[PDB]
Amino acid sequence: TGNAQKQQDINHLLDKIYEPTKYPDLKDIAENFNPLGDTSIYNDHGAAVETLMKELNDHRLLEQRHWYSLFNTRQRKEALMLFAVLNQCKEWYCFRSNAAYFRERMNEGEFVYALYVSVIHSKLGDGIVLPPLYQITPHMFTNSEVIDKAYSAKMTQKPGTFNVSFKNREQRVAYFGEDIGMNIHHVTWHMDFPFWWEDSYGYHLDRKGELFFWVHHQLTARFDFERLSNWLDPVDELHWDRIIREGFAPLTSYKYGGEFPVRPDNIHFEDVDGVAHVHDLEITESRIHEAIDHGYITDSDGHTIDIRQPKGIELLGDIIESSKYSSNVQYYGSLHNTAHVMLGRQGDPHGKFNLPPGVMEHFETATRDPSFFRLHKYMDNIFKKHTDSFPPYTHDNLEFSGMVVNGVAIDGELITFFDEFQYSLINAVDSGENIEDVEINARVHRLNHNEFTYKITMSNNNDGERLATFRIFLCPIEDNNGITLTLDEARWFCIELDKFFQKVPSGPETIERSSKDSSVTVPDMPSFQSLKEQADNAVNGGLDLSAYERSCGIPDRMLLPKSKPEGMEFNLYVAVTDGDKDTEGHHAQCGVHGEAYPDNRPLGYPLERRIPDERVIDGVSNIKHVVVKIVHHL
Amino acid sequence: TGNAQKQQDINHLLDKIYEPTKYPDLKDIAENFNPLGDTSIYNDHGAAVETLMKELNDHRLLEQRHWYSLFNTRQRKEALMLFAVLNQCKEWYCFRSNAAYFRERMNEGEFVYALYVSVIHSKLGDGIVLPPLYQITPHMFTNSEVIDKAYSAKMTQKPGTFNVSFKNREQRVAYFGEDIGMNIHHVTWHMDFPFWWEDSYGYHLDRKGELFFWVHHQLTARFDFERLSNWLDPVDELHWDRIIREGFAPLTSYKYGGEFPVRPDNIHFEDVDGVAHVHDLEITESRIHEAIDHGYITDSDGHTIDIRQPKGIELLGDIIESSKYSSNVQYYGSLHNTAHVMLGRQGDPHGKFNLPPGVMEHFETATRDPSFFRLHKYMDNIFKKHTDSFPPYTHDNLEFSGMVVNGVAIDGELITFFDEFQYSLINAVDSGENIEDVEINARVHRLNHNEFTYKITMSNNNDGERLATFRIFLCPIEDNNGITLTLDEARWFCIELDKFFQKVPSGPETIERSSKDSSVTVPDMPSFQSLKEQADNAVNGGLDLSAYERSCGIPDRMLLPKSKPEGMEFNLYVAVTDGDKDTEGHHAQCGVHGEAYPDNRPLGYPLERRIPDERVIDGVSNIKHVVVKIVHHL
Ligand SMILES: [Cu+2]
Ligand SMILES: [Cu+2]
Ligand SMILES: [Cu+2]
Ligand SMILES: [Cu+2]
């Protein structure tokens, strides 16, 4: 073991992935190993192994140097079998071996996918930090131009970094969707808590349901915000009976595959052969919308499982996205997933052209296409229908008697601008042998803000020390019409900025906290070379980069919304609930390994419920709202 | 001079076009020359030169390593200025110089275009054979896959040759449209007789009008035939008020530019910003259709120019395509051309995506897209409306008293199969310096037939030697329903197979002629390396290369249609008209330089007119029809 070992191995595995490995060890392994000759390394007595082999043998596994979408029911199954081996290894000797043996005869997508999920969930992958997808397989995160510029570099053996690109559209709020950080998170989030997880794999992802509800509600919110800042209007909800108003051209290309199919604007949704009928959604949507409206979800037996309770919204998220936690998957089908594949072939439904899958039929690339947000607004208000059926909250309800926020102040400035980043285009260009490596780079333009700190002034009238949950939302104020909405109109529009638990003493305290300590944030990740340089140094000298092991969050750069240059006033919500009942039972942020989500309040507390008369939020001591102002430096 | 010189120079000029020249001579020229210091080499006292310079100087000329469509009113103008210099050179010292000087600071497309047109039309380019576009700029004629396979070859410096590709469509009659020979011809035909020719350039292309009418009538016919052979039905005529039923994905890529924009099926024609309104066509079409119907074309003054005469159909072709021979271009606009650009941006009319031009906005690539033939059927029956207004032909009309065809026979076997061809992908991949040349090749699958000869047996009942025009059409018989049409239904459907003038001696003769001597055919062209090798062998060893210096025709391989394996019976038409009245006045096939078309009969004689009662064709001695049969070897 070690890690600067485990780590090393990983880096080697995912190095120049589109070509047989150049690391000699990996290849004699790749050749001499037999996953079937010491059914003991395996905790299954190698049933997993024996099942991959069988396929690899009848050679009925997807070919190498071919595309792969995680939405392809077979490609998925294959990818997921590698997971299942790697997964029941007792120690490194068995992982390295397989993710070498297979690495060399299994397709790259299945492989990249398999290795990551495996590293993330398997018992055996603690020490490791995974290189950033963007540099491992750059075709999924880089433009088509820069890609070709990189192939030229290589043809000519002349190095250097190319500048990527992005007045005519709404490819004005593009900086958001096309960011390599969001794209990362978006994929990671669904790697952390995959739709395909069976608790057989080892543990149970806790509230994947609410997690699902919430994560998208926030992309959806975060997204709505940016369009605000751009004189753009909140996003249309997608309907199956209407036209797809805003279509786009991605100008993105597959490594092996071709160029992502484009969609024209004002198109009519076609029945796509092999996935499902347009109507098939319409009905699914109905079945869903009836559970919500009845009060119950009905399983396979005709057993009504009640959802007019706290477990409610997850049971709902199980049927909506359609993970395996689904009660009656034969009835409620899979709205979300199908909706993906469904929106993707819109470029070729009967498939007369044999265009590859589309931007939306992939996690590291969906945020790309505009209907992405159109499709999640729709999912969003499916949930809202349920979320909203609860009776508003009472006074006695929000009140954390004693504790009272006196004041809230921002110790700094809220200022956002446009930084510049560089990732490397090397895994993208093929370098054969005895021809050498030319360093080609890609330079992108991403958003950023300035660290700032919070000065939360507040008195614990209670006799002594109480644990407290510091909940901070950033809601909007006006309409982009100039209509000041109402913490009903705006409660749902708010994006979570931070959530943390601090013990409060008996008396006037002044709790301070930084842009940096935010719980919904993750720093940009270490470069690959960086992770190489570092793996290698430990192994030859004698790696606690327990910075980057889990990381569920969004990019720190994305914390605050972009804003206007003129500036705008947002409304800052500081709600301080009672820590002892919250954490009334138990990372725990990235419960990647079965780790029980620590907060018990539902998600978005306490703005997740109808707020009919603001009269109320306003009279609980432990809730306080102060207006902030964000400015954008050009 | 020489030619094995002129030639050499050319080959050098058009080598690895996408990069500054490696031929030292070309560069000191490229540097030291000044197109403005001996205004004497120029027959204009260099007004041309002084106009390019002015642009090159204010640097308002299109950039290098960028795309270019010949449909772009500016790109065209720029391209066409180079033509105008190269054009008024007195000798080689001035051409070489310029097409060196410019070659290095003008864009490649303008440049390639400029050089060819210039070589083709300028007084000074007799000896020369131009390399095949397909190998000069392979991106416009080669797939998107093979192209990438070639970039890989190059990256790794491992040579190869790749096999190109083409059950779900009508990309079953694809072999026709995607052939590198047709594509060549199509562009050449439009280089030979350009729409932009002003007679200031030096001479007058004779019947560009009828030429235009006809050339497209035959692609259109030839095309209809192939679809026959494929259980496919004759092509729909395109309308501006209907859906674009049948769209395609070209899977083709620009060198500098991106991937050609694709079109979804069942699309509605959008008003495309910058080119023209959909309605703008509709009216044009009307104005056109009213000339035809009135009997006259009305010019700018309100002068009615009659067209119910022989000059008729060309005057019509001048206004329809809209060349500069147009009588009232401000009124009849440019249906054909505009229709090209109009159909191309259908992927991006308001241009929100900034997709490059499309397959149809280029001559070496339009035959690609299915609406290509849909758009020419439409143009086709615009002409037919006029062509058909003439009173049928009388008996006394077709009769070449004396001369009488006794019999007609094919002396071979009519057999068409699928050969294999290889062109080179080198100008496509960038090779910088001190990095050496790897030979990469592309292998295509093209149609072919077997030389066969005609055995035309016929007696001269007259008293002593009459000249004769041997006109041979290949008409269809059955419907693809199995209905069997009527040399009215089928007269227009016939493709020209040969046309030649032979002296018929008095009495029983038996003229024989070959597949090879056909007048509507051209052999595949010499390779580039071949043309290099041969150019090069004749500097050093003190070049005829005469077979390919103009070349209007279609590929010999395309002579006969594809057919069925079962075989089908076509109807062979041998009509022998009177040579002395035909050539009653004067290459002359490729009148590229002002050379008066030799035949005087209108075009398609004598099948261009309504044939109401076959009763007639049937009773002129000098017309004879015999059924042939074509078989396809799988
Ligand atoms: Cu997602
Ligand atoms: Cu989603
Ligand atoms: Cu044409
Ligand atoms: Cu045309």
Curated annotation (Swiss-Prot), chains A, B:
GO terms for molecular function: metal ion binding; oxidoreductase activity; oxygen carrier activity. Keywords: Copper, Disulfide bond, Glycoprotein, Metal-binding, Oxygen transport, Secreted, Transport. It comes from the Eukaryota. Residues 584-597 are annotated as: Disordered. Cu cation A binds at H186, H190, H216. Cu cation B binds at H336, H340, H376. Hemolymph. One of its GO terms (cellular component) is extracellular region. Coiled coil: none annotated. Its main location: secreted. The keyword Secreted applies. Gene3D superfamilies: Di-copper center containing domain from catechol oxidase, Hemocyanin, C-terminal domain, Hemocyanin, N-terminal domain. Disulfide bonds join C89-C94, C475-C494, C552-C590. PROSITE patterns: HEMOCYANIN_1, HEMOCYANIN_2, TYROSINASE_2. It holds the Pfam family Hemocyanin_M. It is found in: Secreted, Extracellular space. InterPro entries: Di-copper_centre_dom_sf (IPR008922), Hemocyanin/hexamerin (IPR013788), Hemocyanin/hexamerin_mid_dom (IPR000896), Hemocyanin_C (IPR005203), Hemocyanin_C_sf (IPR037020), Hemocyanin_N (IPR005204), Hemocyanin_N_sf (IPR036697), Ig_E-set (IPR014756). Glycans are attached at N163. Hexamer of a number of different chains, of which A, B, and C have been identified. Belongs to the tyrosinase family. Hemocyanin subfamily. Hemocyanins are copper-containing oxygen carriers occurring freely dissolved in the hemolymph of many mollusks and arthropods. The A chain contains two copper-binding sites. Three histidine residues are ligands to each copper ion. This is Hemocyanin A chain. The lineage of its organism: Eukaryota, Metazoa, Ecdysozoa, Arthropoda, Crustacea.
